Amino acid sequence: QSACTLQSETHPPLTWQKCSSGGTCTQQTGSVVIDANWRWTHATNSSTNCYDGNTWSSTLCPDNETCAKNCCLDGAAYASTYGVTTSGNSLSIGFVTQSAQKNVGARLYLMASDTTYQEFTLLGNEFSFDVDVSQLPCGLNGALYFVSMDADGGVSKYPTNTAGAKYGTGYCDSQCPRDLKFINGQANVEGWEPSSNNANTGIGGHGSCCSEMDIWEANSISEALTPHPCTTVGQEICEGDGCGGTYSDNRYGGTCDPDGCDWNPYRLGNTSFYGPGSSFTLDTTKKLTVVTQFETSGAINRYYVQDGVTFQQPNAELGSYSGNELNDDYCTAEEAEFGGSSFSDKGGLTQFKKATSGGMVLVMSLWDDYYANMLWLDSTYPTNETSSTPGAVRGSCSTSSGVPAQVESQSPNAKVTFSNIKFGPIGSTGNPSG
Numbered sequence: 001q002s003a004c005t006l007q008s009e010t011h012p013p014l015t016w017q018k019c020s021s022g023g024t025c026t027q028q029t030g031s032v033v034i035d036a037n038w039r040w041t042h043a044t045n046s047s048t049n050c051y052d053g054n055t056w057s058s059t060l061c062p063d064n065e066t067c068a069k070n071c072c073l074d075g076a077a078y079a080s081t082y083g084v085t086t087s088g089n090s091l092s093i094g095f096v097t098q099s100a101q102k103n104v105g106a107r108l109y110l111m112a113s114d115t116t117y118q119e120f121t122l123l124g125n126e127f128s129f130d131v132d133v134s135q136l137p138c139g140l141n142g143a144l145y146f147v148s149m150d151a152d153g154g155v156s157k158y159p160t161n162t163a164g165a166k167y168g169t170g171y172c173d174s175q176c177p178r179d180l181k182f183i184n185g186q187a188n189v190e191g192w193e194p195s196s197n198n199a200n201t202g203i204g205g206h207g208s209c210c211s212e213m214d215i216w217e218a219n220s221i222s223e224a225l226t227p228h229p230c231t232t233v234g235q236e237i238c239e240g241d242g243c244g245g246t247y248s249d250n251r252y253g254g255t256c257d258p259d260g261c262d263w264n265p266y267r268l269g270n271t272s273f274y275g276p277g278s279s280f281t282l283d284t285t286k287k288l289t290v291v292t293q294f295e296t297s298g299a300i301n302r303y304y305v306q307d308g309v310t311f312q313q314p315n316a317e318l319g320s321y322s323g324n325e326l327n328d329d330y331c332t333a334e335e336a337e338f339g340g341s342s343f344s345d346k347g348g349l350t351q352f353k354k355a356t357s358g359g360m361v362l363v364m365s366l367w368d369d370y371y372a373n374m375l376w377l378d379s380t381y382p383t384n385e386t387s388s389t390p391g392a393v394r395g396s397c398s399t400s401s402g403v404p405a406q407v408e409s410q411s412p413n414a415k416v417t418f419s420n421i422k423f424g425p426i427g428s429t430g431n432p433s434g
């Protein structure tokens with residue numbers, strides 16, 4: 001797709017800290033950009049929509065190539081349309097925002113310039129952020145994560161994408177998402193099926209795969225840390241059900257692991273660690289600091305800070321594994337005890353280290369779940385299981401929770417605030433900010 005300018009595009013500024021092994025940090029000035037799927041897509045020479053509700057214009061978009069030639073992405077009113085605001089080092093994302101239409105959530109990328117994404121090499125380094133999840137009830141996910149996207153949003157590879165990172169193109173993740181309207185400089189109208197339960201979305205014949213590091217998928221009830229490997233590290237198109245992921249009938253596709261080696265302390269048995277109020281180790285009614293470290297072995301370490309008190313990731317005992325480091329032993333114990341082979345099938349932490357050794361783009365989002373009601377995060381899943389099935393219980397939310405229409409109606413002013421992002425060598429991000 002190309003870019004149009006009927007609506008101006010001004011990326012909300014956002015600062016972050018780059019820290020040094022020598023003990024100092026230096027402020028960096030970036031911004032955020034909303035993913036292309038949230039944008040108005042219209043004809044290049046008129047206001048006629050290329051996509052509206054959950055269907056494509058059959059005349060502008062008779063096939064994927066003609067559609068991209070005829071159509072452009074336009075600018076975003078971040079606050080008034082999308083409920084996205086920033087101030088200094090803080091980003092807030094509202095849940096439901098009512099303007100001329102209803103918008104739900106947002107997916108945002110951290111930029112390096114007005115036209116390029118910021119890339120982070122995670123291996124050897126650590127990433128810290130503050131988060132306020134107090135206004136995230138059951139069924140919501142305020143996510144902070146990394147994906148192996150191209151810094152230009154795909155422009156250099158696909159000529160027919162001229163909108164680029166400035167307009168939030170080029171997304172991929174380990175679901176190989178098929179809900180994307182543009183992939184590889186072409187539309188996704190071919191094979192498009194509108195969602196039965198979402199007036200704004202559908203599933204196309206193509207998806208966009210790449211490695212994904214879920215630092216943080218969480219609400220006020222549960223939180224999870226999850227690396228996802230793919231057989232190809234970076235961005236790659238997939239065909240139909242070969243994509244797997246949430247958007248295919250068979251979740252387990254040909255290239256990516258859509259489940260990951262997840263670490264949710266509640267799921268692992270510590271139901272007192274993270275939750276709302278002073279009866280939890282970390283009180284989710286208040287801001288907390290989350291630090292994630294990528295040691296060169298390929299293992300992942302985690303600690304948290306709240307009220308100046310530090311907590312390592314709680315210890316877990318699972319099969320023959322015991323510890324709090326997310327390593328090969330943890331991931332293979334998890335498969336043995338909870339079931340599944342997706343993570344190891346796609347190459348495990350060894351394959352995942354190939355992603356963290358390269359550049360990845362920072363994503364921050366807020367969503368509800370039109371496929372599984374976020375039950376995998378904060379409830380018992382599958383919902384016919386009990387606490388006696390290992391790993392079935394992931395949080396304390398009712399198995400009835402998280403119906404999108406319901407949570408949108410009841411909790412429209414839910415929000416997540418991410419702040420004070422700091423990045424640098426392991427051991428550096430707790431040092432004084434510059």
Ligand SMILES: O=[N+]([O-])c1ccccc1O[C@@H]1O[C@H](CO)[C@@H](O[C@@H]2O[C@H](CO)[C@@H](O)[C@H](O)[C@H]2O)[C@H](O)[C@H]1O
Binds near residue numbers: 258259262382
């Ligand atoms: O529910 N099961 O039948 C099952 C059995 C054995 C292992 C895992 C199971 O459920 C799966 O759990 C995964 C870990 O919680 C889920 O993976 C998450 O999926 C979400 C939504 O796609 C994604 O955002 C996370 O990053 C990912 O870890 C999986 O959905 C679920 O089926």
Ligand SMILES: O=[N+]([O-])c1ccccc1O[C@@H]1O[C@H](CO)[C@@H](O[C@@H]2O[C@H](CO)[C@@H](O)[C@H](O)[C@H]2O)[C@H](O)[C@H]1O
Binds near residue numbers: 307308
């Ligand atoms: O209370 N402590 O021991 C402590 C120690 C270190 C950091 C933070 C601590 O307490 C928390 O301090 C926050 C910042 O002052 C408080 O959050 C603020 O609360 C006010 C009043 O409710 C509110 O207007 C602000 O928007 C909010 O940030 C927090 O309540 C407190 O636990």
Ligand SMILES: *[C@@H]1O[C@H](CO)[C@@H](O)[C@H](O)[C@H]1NC(C)=O
Binds near residue numbers: 269271272281312
């Ligand atoms: C949960 O983790 C916290 C922090 O490590 C620890 O203090 C607490 O004892 C743990 N509780 C349980 C039930 O494991």
Ligand SMILES: [Co+2]
Binds near residue numbers: 206239
């Ligand atoms: Co094809």
Ligand SMILES: [Co+2]
Binds near residue numbers: 325
């Ligand atoms: Co280690």
